[PDB]
Amino acid sequence: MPPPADIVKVAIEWPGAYPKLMEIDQKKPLSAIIKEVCDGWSLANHEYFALQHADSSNFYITEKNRNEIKNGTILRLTTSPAQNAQQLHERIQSSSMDAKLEALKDLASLSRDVTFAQEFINLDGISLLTQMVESGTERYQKLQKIMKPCFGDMLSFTLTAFVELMDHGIVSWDTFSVAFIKKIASFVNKSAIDISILQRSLAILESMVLNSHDLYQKVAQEITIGQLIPHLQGSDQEIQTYTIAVINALFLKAPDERRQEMANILAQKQLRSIILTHVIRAQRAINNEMAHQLYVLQVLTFNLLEDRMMTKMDPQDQAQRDIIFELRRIAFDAESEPNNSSGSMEKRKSMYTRDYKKLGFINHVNPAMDFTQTPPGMLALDNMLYFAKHHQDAYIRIVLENSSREDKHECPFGRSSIELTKMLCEILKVGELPSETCNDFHPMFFTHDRSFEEFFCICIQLLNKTWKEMRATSEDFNKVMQVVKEQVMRALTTKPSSLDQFKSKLQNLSYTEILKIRQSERMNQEDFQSRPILELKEKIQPEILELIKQQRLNRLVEGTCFRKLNARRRQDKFWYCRLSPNHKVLHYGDLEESPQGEVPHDSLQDKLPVADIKAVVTGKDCPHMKEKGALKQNKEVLELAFSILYDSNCQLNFIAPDKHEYCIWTDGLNALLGKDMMSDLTRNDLDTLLSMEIKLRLLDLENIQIPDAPPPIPKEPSNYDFVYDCN
Amino acid sequence: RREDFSLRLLTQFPNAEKMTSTTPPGEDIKSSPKQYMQCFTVKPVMSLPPSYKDKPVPEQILNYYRANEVQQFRYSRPFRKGEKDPDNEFATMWIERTTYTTAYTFPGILKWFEVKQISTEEISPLENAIETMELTNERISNCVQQHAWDRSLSVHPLSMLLSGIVDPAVMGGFSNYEKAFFTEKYLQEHPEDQEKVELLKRLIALQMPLLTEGIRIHGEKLTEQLKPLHERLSSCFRELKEKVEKHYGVITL
Amino acid sequence: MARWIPTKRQKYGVAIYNYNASQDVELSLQIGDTVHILEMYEGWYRGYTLQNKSKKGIFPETYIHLKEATVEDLGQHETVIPGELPLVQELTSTLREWAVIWRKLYVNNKLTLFRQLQQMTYSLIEWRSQILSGTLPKDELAELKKKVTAKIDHGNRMLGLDLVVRDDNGNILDPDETSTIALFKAHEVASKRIEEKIQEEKSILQNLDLRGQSIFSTIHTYGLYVNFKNFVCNIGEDAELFMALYDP
Amino acid sequence: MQAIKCVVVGDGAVAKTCLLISYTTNAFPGEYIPTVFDNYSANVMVDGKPVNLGLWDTAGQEDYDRLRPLSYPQTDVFLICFSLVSPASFENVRAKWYPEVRHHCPNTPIILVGTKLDLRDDKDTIEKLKEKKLTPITYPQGLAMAKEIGAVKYLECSALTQRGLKTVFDEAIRAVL
């Protein structure tokens, strides 16, 4: 509630005015402060000047931005945002050239000013940008033909102002006319140009893409994959950034049917590899933004594989049936007669049985029941096809090894391929929706168009070689599959950057010696933490958390003199909330200013089951805080405001006496919700107590140490023929 | 009120789940776990004040015996039986009032008790009209009498009544009687049960002097704001007077 | 599962780490998961668990951290120093008592006392660890024995528990129920120390110098610690500082 | 011991009759007794002291505007009503009832009250509203209308529920007291 320091000793200037430092009070309307300042500089017409910070902002002081007036921040009086907007209509659209250029650099610098943006959008000067750089382009053609460096700089600043006024959105996005995209095209379509023009032009390309899908379609004719590459070849990092962002945009707003096409075109024009050789292992830097761009390229190829990942395609379709038959022939024929290539149905069942009890398939009526689970289904088939094209060596050897073994040591190739593909898809983020969140990029994916597929082939190779080193079976098929996934993790953490490095890392991970190194790292990470003992501790976890929960629930029972919606004027800043031992009824609400708090009776809000209670939202999440009128409470009770859902019309918009008890209450309610807690006190107390507790267990073993790793099991006499009986 | 009591009882219990067909029990619930219950206010059957059978008993006496020393209870069951005309609700109203005979009489040693024995009834809209209008009449008797002894009184509920009765405004009860029973179509549906409709005629007949005390005490307690009221009341009142004389065809008294 | 042997050399039925529930009475054992075993098979041990002394637990011999003896420390001479590991094992039992006692404490909020409980507990456990070897010289054993018995009785006086007895070398010699009057007077002396300690707690809760003289009644030789730094001035000539104590 | 007049009016397609009669009857939801008379009453303790009250349950047709003002004096509070699932009721109230009742007793606490809260979220009903271009208008704009008048309070109930119905009448009685 209470106001900040209103009396503030700030410098107040006007360009050319020597500052005079008073004790300005911020409470009175800013018209009066501007009035006294202007009269001090002998200025009438107060509404036509607005103060602004002499900060790097140059942002005009309105009522929205005067809580940024801190002791020592110089105030620089100048024209009010509406006056600056009108100044800009006349010095952005006009026929003067230098005035346009400098005023437009001003407008670009000033668009970030929302206070200016209000009246400038009321003036609609972005349309005036439209005229100045589409009409103005043809007014001065005779000599702009030679002014084109300076003219391009003018139009680049127009682009800057256009985007930095479009972001406000108070003016609709389509303020530009088609000649605007004609100029942007002339920037993207043509040969190399100035860095600023190309930068802001690619920015505006991706801006129209962002605006609408129709704007996407109409900009696509100006953004061609053939012409979008020289911007990458424009060695400057930022040109590469924006051209890859435009690539991502073209992937994004296109229909998936055209998304496959553009993934193919990315493949042919080398976009994958050429961006690899221009940024990744070249002399250009991977920023966070370059990480995002390369990541979204790889993820876009991934999610155009997702078209064959997500869905469940036909297992028994005759075309896919024949293509898996030809895959199983080019794979299995090294141990098959030439008769079974096109054998009868009865022979198909017989060869299924012989050749798939060698692959432990439960349903041997159709191997497609090992492709009937998706992802990938048909894209495991695609992996088989790629091996037929690129990795038929690993394909054939892994098939033959498992084609020579009925026993459980077998590698169920339909099953192994399907589940290997799906696991490395989830691990490698194959087929995910592109999002800027994940901020890494894998160069190993940019070393190969189908590096996904070679990843899968090399992991099947390492899988089976390590099986012949780990005598792995198909009852451990899940277990040794997790072993192979661990191999993949111990590769990916080291971040292999290409095909050869991934090969070398996986082979070095092939249980030769580095096991002792990584379990030594585990011994190190128990030496201060006791990892087997961590298993011990967190094993029986729920006792301490549950007792904490019922503890805090008791606290809810004994509750407090809670606080309300603006519980201020004769209002109950104090009202009790007693849970009854029912633990279904809560006695709370508009309860009087209570000295001892809880009188147990049918409170003014006497009932509260978990049943009506959906969830709680805390602080600014409270719709009464999101209430912008009579329920405007100040945000310092954030740690006090909650809002529990019930009946979707009556809320628990209420305030807490302080923070930690607020946390305790919310913990208890979440316990009623049956979820985690939200007191840090909770985590701290639980960790210290359980740690000490388990420390209160070492009392038995000490002065002799623990075998941390599990010993073997000394054998028993299986019978119960006790030499000494029980009891 | 009812569900305040429902709340207090749910308090008493875990498994706060309520039956909803408030009148009948549920056989599956007779055996199924997950305890059920159902709450509904019931009707305290009037006492039988001994030795007061006809005497000029005052009000306090009757009001006290009204609520206490009670061992019978009813619960009136709105129920459609017949054709469901839109214009009316009365064409089907059949009331299966439920008898509640408990062991003892409130007040008692316990603020509640079991029921010892239950039974139901079945009430024709003929009858329904009969007793409903009847009880309405004695309610009028109550208001007129209570201001017949009291004077320093809020005459307002008298205005309540005289308004509500004088115009069956949103729904015309008296014409409803006419159409439902007085019309001979009913006396082909229930020819022999003209014995009933003649009772209703007798009832509106006795209503007439009763509403007449209503009118005269209104006039005595008439204040200037009651005047437009009373003019419409008396207008429609001798209107319904001649109605009972001939249009209702009841023999007046 | 068979070939079990009647012996007491498996009362060290002591866990090493987590296990599984493969047997009827098994689980991921804790650290202090002692099982008071009788059925002695070579590779596997089954006998009454500490948690359930009416039920066995069948646990692998290498998973067992067996030691020869019983829960005792002096009959088979499992003391690192003779006779006082009986004290530390009863201490451990007392620690398990404190364990549950606080595991009811948190529901009430007096829990600063809960805190000081665990801090005394940390004192106790680190003493446990230091005495787990033959570290200290034996006079220090005596002194710290008095201190740890002090802490034990402090807890039990806090926690409405008994009076333990026999301060020196065992706390339990005296309750051998051999004499009787000595028991009464030892109970008496323990009560004295308890009352002294609660008085000193409620007094050092207020006073901080009467405690000093209560300590210094016996000893009367002390040393006032002096540490001089520099005389701040320019004497310009050689000087000599003469620090003597004077009684006006 | 005391009494309180009050009036209720609303659209004729909703029969607030059912509301009041089920309330004072106290009977089960959707099982109330339909009577032959209007103008119901209730003797209820609200807070501390019991109070009687009778509700002028009036016919709402406009041609009955000529009888209703005769009872306008000493209307302790009024209860203006509608149906949530009826935008037609919205038009009725906003255009006729709200204006002329505001005119008639401009200085007396007034609470608008919803209706058919259960029907307001009947999916078949609201899909009929869309296939008849009636809008299943929700609470917040109803509250917005309450602010339009700045009514001393606003609520909704539902007859097939009695939800808030008790509370409806609770604020109703305590507005006077």
Residue numbers in the entry:
A (entry chain A): 1 to 727
B (entry chain B): 1390 to 1642
C (entry chain B): 1 to 248
D (entry chain C): 1 to 177
Quote what the paper states about this structure.
The components used in this analysis included DOCK5ΔC, ELMO1FL, RhoGQ61L, and the nucleotide-deficient Rac1G15A mutant (GTPase domain, residues 1−177). From this partial map, we reconstructed the entire RhoG/DOCK5/ELMO1/Rac1 complex at 4.7 Å resolution with an ordered RhoG-ELMO1NTD. In the RhoG-bound DOCK5ΔC/ELMO1FL/Rac1G15A complex, a curved dimer formed, with RhoG located at both protomer tips. Rac1 interacted with the DHR-2 domain of DOCK5 and the PH domain of ELMO1 near the dimer interface, akin to the prior DOCK5ΔC/ELMO1FL/Rac1G15A ternary complex. Notably, ELMO1NTD was disordered in the previous ternary structure. However, in the present RhoG-bound structure, the α-solenoid of ELMO1NTD arched toward the DHR-1 domain of DOCK5 and bound to RhoG in cooperation with the C2 domain of DOCK5. Due to this binding mode, the ELMO1NTD of the RhoG/DOCK5/ELMO1/Rac1 complex had a compact, open conformation that was different from the elongated (S-shaped) open conformation of the DOCK2/ELMO1/Rac1 complex. In the present RhoG/DOCK5/ELMO1/Rac1 structure, the C-terminus of RhoG, Pro181, near the lipidation site, is adjacent to the phosphatidylinositol (3,4,5)-trisphosphate binding site of DOCK5, which includes basic residues such as Lys457, Lys460, and Lys464. Four membrane-binding sites (two DHR-1 and two RhoG) were aligned in the same direction in the dimeric configuration. Thus, the present structure suggests that RhoG and the symmetric DOCK5/ELMO1 dimer can simultaneously bind to the plasma membrane.
The dedicator of cytokinesis (DOCK)/engulfment and cell motility (ELMO) complex serves as a guanine nucleotide exchange factor (GEF) for the GTPase Rac. RhoG, another GTPase, activates the ELMO-DOCK-Rac pathway during engulfment and migration. The DOCK-A (DOCK1/2/5) and DOCK-B (DOCK3/4) subfamilies specifically activate Rac and have an Src homology domain at their N-terminus; the Src homology domain is involved in autoinhibition and binding to engulfment and cell motility (ELMO) scaffold proteins. ELMO is structurally divided into two domains: an N-terminal domain (NTD), consisting of the Ras-binding (RBD), ELMO inhibitory (EID), and ELMO domains, and a C-terminal domain (CTD), consisting of the Pleckstrin homology (PH) domain and proline-rich region.
